[PDB]
Amino acid sequence: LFDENYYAKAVANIIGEVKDPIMYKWFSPDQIEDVDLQMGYQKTVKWDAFLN
């Protein structure tokens, strides 16, 4: 792919020069978790237990 896509090769070469986002300072490492989606909606289910 790199032999054919000069733009992809340049993106891969210069991808490291972009600075990290500053929003990471506003969250703990455990608070962030990636998901696999581009556009749409996703449902999250939270389970709990109680004593009767």
Binding site: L1, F2, A12, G16, Y24
Partner: protein, 37 residues
Amino acid sequence: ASLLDSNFVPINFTEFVQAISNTYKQRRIQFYENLKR
């Protein structure tokens, strides 16, 4: 599959995008490792 690995060679644009996402995740992990408060 990460762009930070010099040995990695993508085959198609889908693999390139996956490598970009993995590189971003690794960079976030490194930033959180190096962060001091």
